[PDB]
Symmetry: C3
Protein backbone atom coordinates (compact mmCIF):
# COMPACT_ATOMS: atom_id res chain seq x y z
CA UNK A 1 0.00 0.00 0.00
CA UNK A 2 2.79 2.45 0.88
CA UNK A 3 4.54 1.96 -2.47
CA UNK A 4 1.60 2.84 -4.73
CA UNK A 5 0.79 5.92 -2.64
CA UNK A 6 4.40 6.99 -3.17
CA UNK A 7 4.00 6.20 -6.89
CA UNK A 8 0.89 8.35 -7.26
CA UNK A 9 2.50 11.27 -5.44
CA UNK A 10 5.57 11.04 -7.67
CA UNK A 11 3.26 11.17 -10.70
CA UNK A 12 1.43 14.22 -9.35
CA UNK A 13 4.72 15.99 -8.62
CA UNK A 14 5.80 15.34 -12.23
CA UNK A 15 2.60 16.82 -13.65
CA UNK A 16 2.98 19.81 -11.33
CA UNK A 17 6.52 20.55 -12.57
CA UNK A 18 5.24 20.33 -16.17
CA UNK A 19 2.44 22.78 -15.29
CA UNK A 20 4.96 25.27 -13.88
CA UNK A 21 7.04 25.04 -17.05
CA UNK A 22 4.00 25.53 -19.29
CA UNK A 23 3.00 28.59 -17.26
CA UNK A 24 6.50 30.08 -17.60
CA UNK A 25 6.32 29.71 -21.39
CA UNK A 26 2.83 31.25 -21.41
CA UNK A 27 4.09 34.25 -19.44
CA UNK A 28 6.97 34.86 -21.88
CA UNK A 29 4.71 34.66 -24.93
CA UNK A 30 2.03 36.83 -23.33
CA UNK A 31 4.79 39.33 -22.54
CA UNK A 32 5.73 39.42 -26.24
CA UNK A 33 2.13 39.79 -27.41
CA UNK A 34 1.56 42.79 -25.15
CA UNK A 35 4.73 44.41 -26.47
CA UNK A 36 3.73 43.58 -30.04
CA UNK A 37 0.33 45.21 -29.55
CA UNK A 38 2.01 48.36 -28.23
CA UNK A 39 4.29 48.45 -31.26
CA UNK A 40 1.27 48.13 -33.58
CA UNK A 41 -0.56 50.88 -31.67
CA UNK A 42 2.36 53.25 -32.26
CA UNK A 43 2.44 52.52 -36.00
CA UNK A 44 -1.31 52.92 -36.52
CA UNK A 45 -1.36 56.18 -34.57
CA UNK A 46 1.44 57.42 -36.82
CA UNK A 47 -0.61 56.47 -39.88
CA UNK A 48 -3.72 58.24 -38.53
CA UNK A 49 -1.95 61.53 -37.72
CA UNK A 50 0.55 61.63 -40.59
CA UNK B 1 -4.88 6.54 5.59
CA UNK B 2 -8.35 7.54 4.36
CA UNK B 3 -7.66 11.28 4.67
CA UNK B 4 -4.63 10.82 2.38
CA UNK B 5 -6.63 9.10 -0.38
CA UNK B 6 -9.17 11.93 -0.21
CA UNK B 7 -6.40 14.53 -0.45
CA UNK B 8 -4.74 12.72 -3.35
CA UNK B 9 -8.02 12.49 -5.26
CA UNK B 10 -8.63 16.20 -4.59
CA UNK B 11 -5.13 17.14 -5.79
CA UNK B 12 -5.51 15.05 -8.93
CA UNK B 13 -8.84 16.74 -9.68
CA UNK B 14 -7.26 20.16 -9.15
CA UNK B 15 -4.38 19.23 -11.49
CA UNK B 16 -6.84 18.25 -14.22
CA UNK B 17 -8.70 21.55 -13.83
CA UNK B 18 -5.40 23.43 -14.16
CA UNK B 19 -4.45 21.42 -17.27
CA UNK B 20 -7.81 22.28 -18.83
CA UNK B 21 -7.46 25.99 -18.08
CA UNK B 22 -3.92 25.97 -19.48
CA UNK B 23 -5.14 24.32 -22.69
CA UNK B 24 -7.73 27.04 -23.24
CA UNK B 25 -5.15 29.72 -22.48
CA UNK B 26 -2.80 28.19 -25.06
CA UNK B 27 -5.57 27.96 -27.66
CA UNK B 28 -6.49 31.63 -27.22
CA UNK B 29 -2.87 32.80 -27.16
CA UNK B 30 -2.21 31.06 -30.48
CA UNK B 31 -5.13 32.91 -32.05
CA UNK B 32 -4.03 36.25 -30.59
CA UNK B 33 -0.53 35.81 -32.04
CA UNK B 34 -2.05 34.83 -35.38
CA UNK B 35 -4.30 37.90 -35.23
CA UNK B 36 -1.43 40.20 -34.26
CA UNK B 37 0.64 39.09 -37.28
CA UNK B 38 -2.32 39.66 -39.59
CA UNK B 39 -2.72 43.19 -38.22
CA UNK B 40 1.03 43.78 -38.70
CA UNK B 41 0.69 42.82 -42.38
CA UNK B 42 -2.29 45.13 -42.81
CA UNK B 43 -0.56 48.11 -41.22
CA UNK B 44 2.56 47.51 -43.35
CA UNK B 45 0.38 47.54 -46.49
CA UNK B 46 -0.97 50.96 -45.50
CA UNK B 47 2.52 52.23 -44.62
CA UNK B 48 3.89 51.17 -47.99
CA UNK B 49 1.02 52.68 -49.94
CA UNK C 1 7.67 7.79 5.00
CA UNK C 2 4.08 8.71 5.95
CA UNK C 3 5.17 12.12 7.19
CA UNK C 4 7.03 12.62 3.90
CA UNK C 5 3.78 11.90 2.07
CA UNK C 6 1.83 14.45 4.12
CA UNK C 7 4.48 17.11 3.52
CA UNK C 8 4.54 16.49 -0.23
CA UNK C 9 0.74 16.56 -0.42
CA UNK C 10 0.63 19.89 1.45
CA UNK C 11 3.42 21.24 -0.77
CA UNK C 12 1.44 20.27 -3.87
CA UNK C 13 -1.78 21.89 -2.59
CA UNK C 14 0.04 25.13 -1.85
CA UNK C 15 1.75 25.18 -5.26
CA UNK C 16 -1.59 24.42 -6.91
CA UNK C 17 -3.10 27.46 -5.20
CA UNK C 18 -0.21 29.64 -6.43
CA UNK C 19 -0.72 28.31 -9.95
CA UNK C 20 -4.45 29.09 -9.80
CA UNK C 21 -3.72 32.67 -8.68
CA UNK C 22 -1.19 33.06 -11.50
CA UNK C 23 -3.66 31.63 -14.02
CA UNK C 24 -6.21 34.17 -12.82
CA UNK C 25 -3.75 37.00 -13.49
CA UNK C 26 -2.92 35.49 -16.91
CA UNK C 27 -6.61 35.41 -17.83
CA UNK C 28 -7.04 39.09 -16.92
CA UNK C 29 -4.08 40.14 -19.05
CA UNK C 30 -5.21 37.86 -21.89
CA UNK C 31 -8.64 39.48 -21.71
CA UNK C 32 -6.97 42.87 -21.98
CA UNK C 33 -4.85 41.87 -25.01
CA UNK C 34 -7.89 40.54 -26.87
CA UNK C 35 -9.73 43.81 -26.25
CA UNK C 36 -6.70 45.78 -27.40
CA UNK C 37 -6.41 43.68 -30.57
CA UNK C 38 -10.07 44.29 -31.45
CA UNK C 39 -9.63 48.05 -31.02
CA UNK C 40 -6.53 47.96 -33.23
CA UNK C 41 -8.40 46.03 -35.92
CA UNK C 42 -11.16 48.65 -36.01
CA UNK C 43 -8.58 51.44 -36.26
CA UNK C 44 -6.66 49.70 -39.04
CA UNK C 45 -9.95 49.04 -40.85
CA UNK C 46 -10.86 52.73 -40.51
CA UNK C 47 -7.72 53.74 -42.42
CA UNK C 48 -8.05 50.88 -44.93
CA UNK C 49 -11.54 52.10 -45.87
CA UNK C 50 -10.06 55.31 -47.30
Amino acid sequence: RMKQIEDKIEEIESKQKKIENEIARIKKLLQLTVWGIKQLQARILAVERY
